RNA sequence: CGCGGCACAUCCACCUUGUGGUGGGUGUGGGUAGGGGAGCGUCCCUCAUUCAGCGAAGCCACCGGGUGACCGGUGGUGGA
RNA sequence: AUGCCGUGGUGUAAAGCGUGGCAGUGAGACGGCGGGGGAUAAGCUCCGUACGUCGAAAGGGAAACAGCCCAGAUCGCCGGC
RNA sequence: UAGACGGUGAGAGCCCGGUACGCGAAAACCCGGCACCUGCCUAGUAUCAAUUCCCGAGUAGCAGCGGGCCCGUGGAAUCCGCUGUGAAUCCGCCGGGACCACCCGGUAAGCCUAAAUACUCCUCGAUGACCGAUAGCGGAUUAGUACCGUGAGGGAAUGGUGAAAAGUACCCCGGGAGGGGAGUGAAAGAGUACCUGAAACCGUGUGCCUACAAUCCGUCAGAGCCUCCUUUUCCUCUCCGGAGGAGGGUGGUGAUGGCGUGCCUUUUGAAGAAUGAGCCUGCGAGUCAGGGACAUGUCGCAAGGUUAACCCGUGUGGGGUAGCCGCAGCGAAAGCGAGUCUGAAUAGGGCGACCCACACGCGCAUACGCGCGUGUGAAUAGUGGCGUGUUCUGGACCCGAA
């Protein structure tokens, strides 16, 4: 409910307490897991194309006549059943996303954080930085030496000196800013971090 | 794309405050000598769709 | 996602085959010939597991029959008097009775013999 | 997490492969008959022999005025439910509560107790609709 | 009828005394078009886990396994 | 005589009715009993029956046999009636 | 600030080419700053009178034959074209759905006008819950080639050695091809006809049956041989083994007997002398778009619910109330409104309200429940998303007519 951990390069800073959209919420599976559901879908591209009758060349002729031939009912060479021939109720390119209620979707949000936070997994710092240039190495010092874990989701915001940069080049961890917040990667991601403006701005948006 | 209603139904049927469909009759409108004032009242009003094709009138006016 | 069907395909198809073994000509080669085989010989098998129980059953009362005459007494008369004497016993096991152990086979003959009641009148 | 993440018992129920052999649903599996069915969905309108119900039912009288100013509804009843109080009542505040439609004219019923004593913004209200408001003491407006 | 094993409704007693199951009893269980319910298998994606050039997949044979769509294991070929 | 409507008791896991969703059938044959057309006819044809069976039902028996007779298979049994 | 893909002898952050990131323009060229260059302007504003003149001419409008506008000639507006007649210059003209009057809006019959918008042969970069050589465009391979057709046009099939060619030197059969022995190679079960090498099919060897016997070519009974194998008398050669034999038991063959009219399609009715299938392999037929519509299961909220378009932002997150369904219906409509309509009234009747295990106060009733307020907690709901089944329009399960 109100927890902080230490600081890279320092002692401890932080001390801020969260609301009850951080903890005290029943989370609902079914929910989540339409939510997910449709994230997932959403991110595919619908490429998935194809080609049929019209679209390939030739096969207007409609040659061995209907009658003394000892021949098939042809009528195309393009036909189905004849290779080189089109396809069927094939994947034609859906472009498609399950439009949802903003309401389930922020239930679901609140719900896996308040899990999270739940199961002690909130780790709320305050910046990221040996001042002023980004430092992989530093980071994963730090972040190994708190969380212990390989999945790891990060919140910064707008903030590229380290925020954005120490971060990369690590297996496992994604980073977003609040408002592209979404539920697949909390769901996936453990040891959840959060910077405080991060908490500052989410937390007003939500009351 | 997006589904049309069938115009005469539309022209023909009247969708009451709750799930009930009405008919005008008027078989009444060529021919009248013959047919007694009696009759006219039989026909005149507004009765409710039988049930044997209401089935089928809800999608036809949807 | 084209899926390539062979695998689903060759599952059954070595299946039937591997069992189709024994039956001539393209029955026990082709997997369209054999499968239509099967077809009628499983039928057959159920119909004739059945058969099966009534043929031995005839065979075993026949052989009763042989073992009676012997002895100078008809089926009829020696199953109606195993019934009066409430001799419980199968034909099955009588049979195997009547081979290995005609003496014992007659006891029971003259006990039936015994429990017949005189004549055919009632 | 994603490994337990699971749904609802009752949604996503199977889909119906249809021609996909015997112990499904059959060879032909839907469309069991050999006439037009087979072949075409039928519209459902066209009978099949004789004069629709369409053409042989007479046309609906009457007709439709382009001029229908029609207004939305207020219950004095939900007033009374709503406003307790009193204080003030107008379409900006049955509006705020959601009670009724943005951008139309408003009457109202005389269907309920009213109690509350409380003038009424609006217009067109019913005979009755004064009785109950200058009953319960308000004043109705126009 | 007898001797045994599965199944759906129902009756009864228990576990949340129908979420769904557990124990017992009666009756039921031929079936096309066709309705309903639950299932088998293949390919791909995600998550978790996990075997693998000390030999994966595919394929061949063998021995077994489930009530079914089918499966597992062993051996050989081959090499991701 | 049968048959039919309706009522009151009795008996039977239960069928029925109304209400919605999704289909099929919309060519029927034979036999039994009553009828018309036809010649006192037909493996003929058009009807009726809360008559069945086949159709969609395997098995026994009728030599073999879809429609008649008996008999409605959950599975197994080298058990009986 | 380099874990993007890839290559490299089997799965690479640190072996390579690369990426992140940061550099890099003589000459040409698009945009862009500046100069020259170019070009407009020696004021028409304020006020008043309205006697004068103008304000788009074979035009508008009208009549006729048509198009198109929700609008099929219907009462037919406005817009467009054709043919004859043929107006006005502000006290004018057009329009406001035949039309007249009043009112209102605006001044046609000259021209130019960027933005929002539509499309990608073609050129970089990037992705893909798209195929991976009978699929993808037909074209991964001499591809719109070969080939067919006088011609318009039609229109094929063929990928894989191994990491590396290390391409079997040499020797022996043989006319050669081809093969063999050596040998390379991890491997030749990797030899140009080359990864794996399926099935139909051909063929060799071998255990069993078969030349006196008729049946969809099987099943069930079932003899005796043969392969294998356990226990055992026994071979005691026994610190070895199961030689052989009896018996027992897997997997073949199966003498001989019983039983039995092949699948599917379509049919009242089929094994058919009713149709289709030579066999194998691969491919091949109920799916998808739409805030479509009815019903349903389940999940958000709760008299509400919900956003579309579009904006911002990066993994598809947050905004965005215009709008829709529900919220009171009846009635042709005016209009009325828990009633309303028809109708002289409505007594009646059509649509919709409000169904109590019931207490307080209370009319009704012996008891049974009717009713007005408060209540023993009396009766209660749609909406949106995701699946299911159906359906409309989309080629719509698929193939085929002339």
Redesign the interface.
């Known amino acids: 409910l109100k927890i902080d951990v230490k600081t890279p390069a320092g002692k401890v800073d932080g001390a801020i307490e969260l609301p009850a959209e951080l903890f005290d919420v029943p989370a609902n599976i079914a929910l989540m897991h339409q939510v997910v559901t449709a994230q997932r879908a959403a991110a595919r591209q619908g490429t998935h194309s194809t080609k049929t009758r019209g679209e390939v060349s030739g096969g207007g002729r409609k040659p061995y006549r209907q009658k003394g031939t000892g021949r098939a009912r042809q009528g195309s060479t393009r036909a189905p059943q004849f290779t080189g021939g089109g396809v069927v109720h094939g994947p034609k390119p859906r472009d498609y996303s399950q439009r949802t209620p903003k309401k389930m979707i922020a239930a679901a949000l609140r719900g896996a954080l308040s899990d999270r936070a739940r199961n002690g997994r909130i780790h709320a710092i305050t910046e990221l930085v040996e001042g002023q240039n980004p430092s992989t190495k530093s980071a994963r010092a730090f972040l190994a030496s708190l969380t212990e874990r390989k999945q790891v989701l990060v919140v910064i915001g707008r903030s590229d000196e380290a925020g954005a940069k120490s971060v990369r080049n690590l297996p496992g961890v994604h980073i977003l800013a609040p408002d592209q917040l979404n539920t697949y990667d909390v769901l996936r991601a453990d040891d959840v971090v959060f910077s405080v403006e991060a908490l500052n701005a989410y937390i007003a948006a939500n009351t | 794309p997006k589904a049309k209603t069938?115009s005469?139904?539309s022209?023909?049927?009247?969708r009451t405050g709750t799930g009930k469909i009405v008919?005008?009759?008027?078989?009444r409108?060529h021919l009248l000598e013959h047919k007694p004032s009696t009759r006219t009242r039989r026909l005149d009003g507004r009765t409710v769709v039988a049930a044997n094709?209401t089935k089928?009138?809800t999608?036809?006016l949807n | 996602a084209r899926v390539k069907r062979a695998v689903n395909a060759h599952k059954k198809r070595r299946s039937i085959l591997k069992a189709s073994r024994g039956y001539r000509g393209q029955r026990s080669r082709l997997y369209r010939k054999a499968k239509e085989q099967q077809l009628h010989s499983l039928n057959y098998a159920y119909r004739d597991r059945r058969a099966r129980k009534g043929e031995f059953r005839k065979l075993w009362i026949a052989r009763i029959n042989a073992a009676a005459r012997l002895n100078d007494i008809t089926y009829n008369r020696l199953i109606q008097g195993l019934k009066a004497a409430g001799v419980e016993v199968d034909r099955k096991n009588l049979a195997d009775i009547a081979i290995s152990d005609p003496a014992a086979f007659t006891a029971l003959v003259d006990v039936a013999r015994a429990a017949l009641p005189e004549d055919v009148n009632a | 997490k994603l490994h337990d993440l699971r749904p609802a018992r009752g949604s996503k129920i199977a889909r119906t492969r249809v021609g996909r052999g015997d112990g499904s649903k059959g060879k032909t599996a839907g469309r069991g008959t050999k006439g037009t069915r087979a072949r075409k969905q039928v519209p459902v309108t066209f009978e099949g022999g004789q004069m629709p119900i369409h053409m042989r039912l007479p046309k609906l009288k009457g007709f439709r005025n382009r001029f229908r100013t029609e207004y939305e509804i207020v219950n004095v009843g939900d007033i009374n439910r709503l406003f307790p109080q009193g204080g003030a009542v107008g379409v900006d505040d049955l509006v705020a509560k959601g009670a009724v439609r943005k951008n139309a004219l408003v009457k109202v019923l005389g269907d309920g107790k009213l109690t509350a004593k409380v003038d009424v913004s609006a217009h067109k209200f019913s005979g009755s609709a004064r009785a109950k408001i200058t009953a319960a003491g308000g004043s109705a407006t126009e």
């Open positions: 069938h005469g139904a022209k023909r049927f009247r008919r005008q009759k008027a078989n409108r094709d089928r009138v999608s036809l």
